[PDB]
Ligand binder design. Sequence first.
Ligand code: CLA
Ligand code: CLA
Ligand code: CLA
Ligand code: CLA
Ligand SMILES: CC(=O)O[C@H]1CC(C)(C)C(=C=C/C(C)=C/C=C/C(C)=C/C=C/C=C(C)/C=C/C=C(C)/C=C/[C@@]23O[C@]2(C)C[C@@H](O)CC3(C)C)[C@](C)(O)C1
Ligand SMILES: CC1=C(C#C/C(C)=C/C=C/C(C)=C/C=C/C=C(C)/C=C/C=C(C)/C=C/[C@@]23O[C@]2(C)C[C@@H](O)CC3(C)C)C(C)(C)C[C@H](O)C1
Ligand code: SF4
Ligand code: SF4
Lengths: 663, 186, 192, 86, 79, 119
Amino acid sequence: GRCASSRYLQVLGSIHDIECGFGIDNTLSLNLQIFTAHWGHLTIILIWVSSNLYHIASNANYSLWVKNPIPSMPIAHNIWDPHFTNSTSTPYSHTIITTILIAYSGIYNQLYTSGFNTINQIYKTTFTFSCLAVISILLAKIHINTHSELLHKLASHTSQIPSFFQLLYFLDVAISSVNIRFNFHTGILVGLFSIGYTGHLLDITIPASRAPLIHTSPSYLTFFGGLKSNTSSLYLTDIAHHHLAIGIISILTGHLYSSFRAALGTYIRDILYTSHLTHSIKSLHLALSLILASCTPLTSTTAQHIYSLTPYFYLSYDHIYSTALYVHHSYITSFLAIASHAHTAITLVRDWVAPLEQESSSKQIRIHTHKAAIISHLSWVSLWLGFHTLAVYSHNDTCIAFNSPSKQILIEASNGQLIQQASGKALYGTINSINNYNKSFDSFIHPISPGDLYVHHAIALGLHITVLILLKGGLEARGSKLMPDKMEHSFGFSCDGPGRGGTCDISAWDSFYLATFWMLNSNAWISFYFHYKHLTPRQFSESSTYLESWFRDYLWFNSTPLIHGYSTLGANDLSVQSWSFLLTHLAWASGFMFLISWRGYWQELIDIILYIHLKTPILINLWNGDIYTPLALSIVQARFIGLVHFSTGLILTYPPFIIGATS
Amino acid sequence: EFAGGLIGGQSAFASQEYNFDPLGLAEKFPEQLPFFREAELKHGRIAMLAWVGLVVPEFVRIPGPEKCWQASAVDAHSACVXXXXXXXXXXXXXXXXXXXXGALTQVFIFCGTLEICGTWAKMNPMGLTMENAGDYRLGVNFLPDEPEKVKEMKLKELKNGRLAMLAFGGAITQATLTGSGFPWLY
Amino acid sequence: XXXXXXXXXXXXXXXXXXXXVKMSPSVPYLPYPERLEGWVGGEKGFDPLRTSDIIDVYWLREAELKHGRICMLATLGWISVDAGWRFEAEMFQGVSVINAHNKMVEMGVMQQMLSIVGVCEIFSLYLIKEGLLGKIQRKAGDYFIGKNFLPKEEDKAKDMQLKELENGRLAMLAFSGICTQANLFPESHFPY
Amino acid sequence: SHAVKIYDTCIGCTLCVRACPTDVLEMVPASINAAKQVASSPRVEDCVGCKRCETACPTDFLSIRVYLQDNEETQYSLGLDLVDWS
Amino acid sequence: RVPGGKRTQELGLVIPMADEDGLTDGQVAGLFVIALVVFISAMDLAKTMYNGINPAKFKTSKGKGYISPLVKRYIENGF
Amino acid sequence: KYGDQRKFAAVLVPLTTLVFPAVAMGMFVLYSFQEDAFWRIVPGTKRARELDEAWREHPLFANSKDPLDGLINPDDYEKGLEEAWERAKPAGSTVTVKDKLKQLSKQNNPHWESWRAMS
Ligand code: CLA
Ligand code: CLA
Ligand code: CLA
Ligand code: CLA
Ligand SMILES: CC(=O)O[C@H]1CC(C)(C)C(=C=C/C(C)=C/C=C/C(C)=C/C=C/C=C(C)/C=C/C=C(C)/C=C/[C@@]23O[C@]2(C)C[C@@H](O)CC3(C)C)[C@](C)(O)C1
Ligand SMILES: CC1=C(C#C/C(C)=C/C=C/C(C)=C/C=C/C=C(C)/C=C/C=C(C)/C=C/[C@@]23O[C@]2(C)C[C@@H](O)CC3(C)C)C(C)(C)C[C@H](O)C1
Ligand code: SF4
Ligand code: SF4
């Protein structure tokens, strides 16, 4: 016997699930594979950085954008596509000149702020980052060899006593050690990296931004505030001082755990054992979940503070950079946030040992004892938010459709206004006690209106429901009342049969699949809020309390330039935006059939098609189907493929709209 | 046993042990007693050399960078380092002086190199204990071969070091308060 | 006592007698680094900073030889160019060694040499890896050149390999003084 | 092939055996219930995985449990008709 | 270029293009050499990850393995 | 001119987006028919068996798959268990600890990892 066509999907669904590998027999192999994969991924990141730097160096106009950044537009890379018109000139080129694309990433402001002035510096930087990619791959090879050499040194290893087998658990102490990793991460990788970047700023960035000054004196460490007037960005001296302070704090903190000597520092196990934790820190899924849950606030605050307090030169002067960066980082942090819950569920399925029935000692145990209370209250708050946001929006829509704008229910956002007032009083007290006052903070505090209150309630509803689905999946991954053996099965499995009431979407993976739709919807709400407030603050402040305003004055109204991109009147430089808009609509709708239509129909359809192929004159004498038997996609594969189509469509439909509306 | 059985705690009236530790740090920190004795001996040796070189420059002054090599013993540190950029940071924009750079940072880097390949190499790599606390195996051939002679020589080193530490503190404080010569008096 | 102690588990360890430890001859207060035993210079047993406690000696001896060999040539190059030995061809009138580097990279002959050094070093990188990985039969810093003038007395070879290291170490400290003295005092010569 | 396991809570219904469409299950004598019989799954290589046996089992939680193994599918566990894997 | 979007037309935003080349062909070739080095090393790394660790090397491979003196300390320092 | 980089594009773009992808797809479909294909996720491959046996040959990982591995002195454990069961044996019970454990270890699951019979 052999396999069917579903082998490809089955293999690719766990192609990186190194725990599911067949040759892997021990944590040594798993940890070494993960470490080597980390090295390869770092190489990929470095090559990507070098790629962007090269294309800015070669197929771009950094040397000219740096001179007049406010009205100029950067170039991403050239367009070489043989499908364009070999005659005339495309709307993306100045007549006979080559074809170009406008960069919406923001690397131009990054390099300008960091101190780049010439193309030659960018070329040297590209070369150095390619060198670093080589170094990373060679480090991967080095560590593979060192661990294989330890394994070979077990050919000259014996304790002369039966305790020699204890060495089995310490072979991967290089990777699995936690105290040393925490100490050196928090100290070196955070604090000293910040201190080195402060040195970079003081040596290059501040010297290459103003007239020549003293030999990088300590007057380069200022405490001004935000939004230097000329470049509309944070003071580079303030940034250097901030990185210096963070570096000092994290360097001091990095001396906490017992890393290299047994006589200094406290152990993480003893820290947890005397607190409300003591979790299984040897689980890789648990660590991954709680660090993905750490990159999530970091990325969300990155999205918030790149816009609110623009740190790069002339970044606020670009109407497309500011929206694209915020939306990108919001989507990245939403993905990481749902990742944290997905891997928490995988941790509970795979890497969690629980007491017999009643020992309420582990934190997961105490959570599982009253998990029903958690889920019931999360459902209650989700229901309240949904009911009272949709109902008030419906009131506003109905009363404004009935020619009565004054009959709306507009709750003044008093709590957010109080927080803003307190923060503004603090900031104004800071500013008034300065001999160099009249500072600006850009959008750190923004006008808050009833529309803001309603949108914040909608966002809270989305977050609550996403957390509800993910938390329910995590807590009932090991067993629910409907299926009280769920931890005997895989993390993702089809169903439990039509009996016992019917059990579609019962696995924890199915809970993740359901929660990804709500993650996408909440992110869409957040991005729509930001983009609408960005396009017209006045119209958002007044007419955003009724959903018809969102439907008309934002979606229908702002989609005018994009659809007009390519038509029977000529093309604009938004032609790619409109074409990708339609393509992403097609991708989004194509995944509906993988979600709505389920397997058996298609399996019968595939049986009919296979009947045809085994009935066609020439095919039957070459291919009997016994080798790679065509079969319909399995249930979990179908749900995942539909989810991928839906996610791709929903995500990639937005950047064309952003570019058409802002540019 | 007091302080892990270290030399230095014995009284001079004999038949008695001063075992001076009013704060009781020896019993509070028995795992850092070798480090405590390392620090005590390092302070004592540095203070001996410091007192000798606090007295000597009042008579002879090496003829060198006139920016330093001049003034009272008090105005000899901040003068022999000059207005460095922030602290012990060489000015790479204008090496060769012409405004601000150190004159002792050479002593600083020599001390750092010696210290790292000295104490740090003694503790971190493949080991200091109670007995080999200040023992860097420097001039041990001069140490007599007798169990009590080595002990009394170590005791004399320790007591001279403590006396030199207190003496340097007093000498530098009096010099700052008054100036003056070797007596360091008003 | 070569072993760090004598025990079965590192909780009831019995440390070796203090007078019985092997001890380094260079740094008398440090125990001998046993990882260096077997290599050429492993009789002065000098490794404080413990950089061989962490890194395979094959790497360090590869780096030590490359530094010494490159410094032995660089010291000779600086001395000869300073004493005045410009190559026979014209376009080589750099007047001074300190400005020879920037002068020649402008002319275009440094880009050629950097390529030729680059390819040989990439070939060296392949050799170093497979040499470490025990796949090829290659020692540290052994690019298989010469090997006919290498003495074959199993002890004279030890001396010559040691002689290469000692001259390499001297050149490392010699060139650093040569280059540093040149910049401080532009008076430029092997005597200075 | 899937994995069909029978647990001690079986009460000899024979409903699981009757519901199986590929004769995977059978009744064996036993002494752990008043029916003096428990189910067995000697031929799970023919178990398609329809889980009708689980639908038919009336114990509080199923005395017969079918564990799906998709990376394990054989021609019999897939119900291949147009194609032979032998 | 034929601009699209209201703001580009109503503000006069323009996209300057350098009349020079950017990078010469020699610089691109210099980058491609190191890119090829990355490529070869990455193919080797992919092979090694695909095949995984070989534990049976101690029966055939030469040498006797090695545990660095710090790795031993990290082993006996704890976990 | 601002062009003259298109000389690189006219070779690289067709190459890496047509020749390399087609060669990759052909090589992938060829690899799909190797006996080693997807040996880490597909059960019953020869290389998986060889890797498992190679792991078992290592002196550290000989008794690694045994869930009961760890008992330093299994004879002491068995003797203590037998002694504890003797004082709690119900009346004239005829079951010993040894055969009880022997029959509790031997289950009847013929269709478990039967895919270890082809490669
Ligand atoms: C927009 C979304 C979308 C799309 C594209 C399809 C497409 C299809 N559905 Mg479907 N379906 C959808 C949504 C969608 N469905 C939804 C929401 C449901 C609700 C459950 C269903 C329910 C459903 C059922 C129940 C059935 C179908 C069937 C079909 C197929 C018949 C049409 C056909 O063969 O045309 C061809 C497919 C196209 C997409 C046309 C365009 C093809 C492109 C434009 C040309 C080729 C592109 C080119 C080669 C690029 C190469 C790729 C690139 C990587 C190089 C087809 C694959 C029927 C079927 O399979 O019977 C034959 C069928 O029985 N669908
Ligand atoms: C006797 C009626 C009754 C009572 C006292 C409660 C009480 C409660 N429900 Mg509830 N519920 C009910 C009926 C009822 N429910 C019905 C019929 C449904 C099906 C739609 C639900 C669906 C439901 C959900 C989905 C959730 C609750 C929750 C809750 C708790 C929080 C309060 C809340 O969310 O209310 C809000 C209640 C609703 C949104 C449901 C609609 C209310 C129905 C229509 C009232 C029917 C009353 C009945 C007709 C009275 C007839 C009397 C007559 C025969 C004499 C609370 C313990 C939440 C929870 O567990 O959090 C702790 C929660 O998440 N309920
Ligand atoms: C802790 C010890 C110590 C320290 C920090 C200083 C620091 C200083 N001395 Mg000073 N000095 C010392 C000991 C010390 N001295 C001793 C012991 C003597 C007697 C020989 C002198 C004699 C001396 C003179 C004559 C002068 C100074 C001066 C100075 C200032 C300029 C630096 C200089 O060139 O010194 C020069 C110092 C020396 C040449 C003596 C070095 C002796 C060292 C401490 C011994 C080596 C220690 C080594 C690490 C251990 C291994 C060797 C061991 C076997 C002995 C500076 C503030 C100058 C100045 O401006 O004064 C105001 C000056 O003119 N010193
Ligand atoms: C890059 C130069 C270099 C390298 C890689 C090596 C490598 C090696 N040497 Mg070696 N050596 C060198 C230069 C070098 N040497 C020089 C210049 C001398 C003359 C003093 C010696 C003298 C020497 C002796 C006497 C012995 C060795 C030995 C060894 C081996 C073990 C030591 C070890 O682990 O250090 C390898 C790692 C390094 C050298 C890295 C050091 C880098 C640090 C951070 C720089 C610190 C110096 C810095 C420039 C000074 C600061 C300036 C200012 C602040 C004062 C190893 C093969 C031993 C041996 O034969 O064992 C088999 C031995 O007995 N060496
Ligand atoms: C190969 C090799 O090399 O081997 C080496 C090995 C080894 C061990 C390193 C060596 C050594 C030994 C050395 C170098 C020993 C040096 C010892 C010194 C300089 C001791 C000074 C003490 C000063 C004191 C107590 C001051 C006391 C001052 C006092 C009490 C002052 C008291 C005042 O009242 C007075 C007098 C004035 C008042 O105004 C105030 C004050 C100042 C307090 C060798 C010999 O080299 C050989
Ligand atoms: C000033 C200056 C500088 C400096 C400096 C320096 C190095 C300053 C150093 C100051 C220093 C080193 C000050 C030591 C004090 C020691 C004390 C107080 C000891 C008390 C000890 C006492 C009170 C002991 C009492 C007892 O004996 C009694 C009475 C009975 C005995 O039975 C027991 C005990 C032991 C209990 C710069 C910064 C380098 C440059 C700047 O430009 C100029
Ligand atoms: S249906 Fe369930 S309880 Fe009845 S005989 Fe079958 S396995 Fe036993
Ligand atoms: S799953 Fe279906 S085929 Fe398999 S044993 Fe149960 S009833 Fe029979």
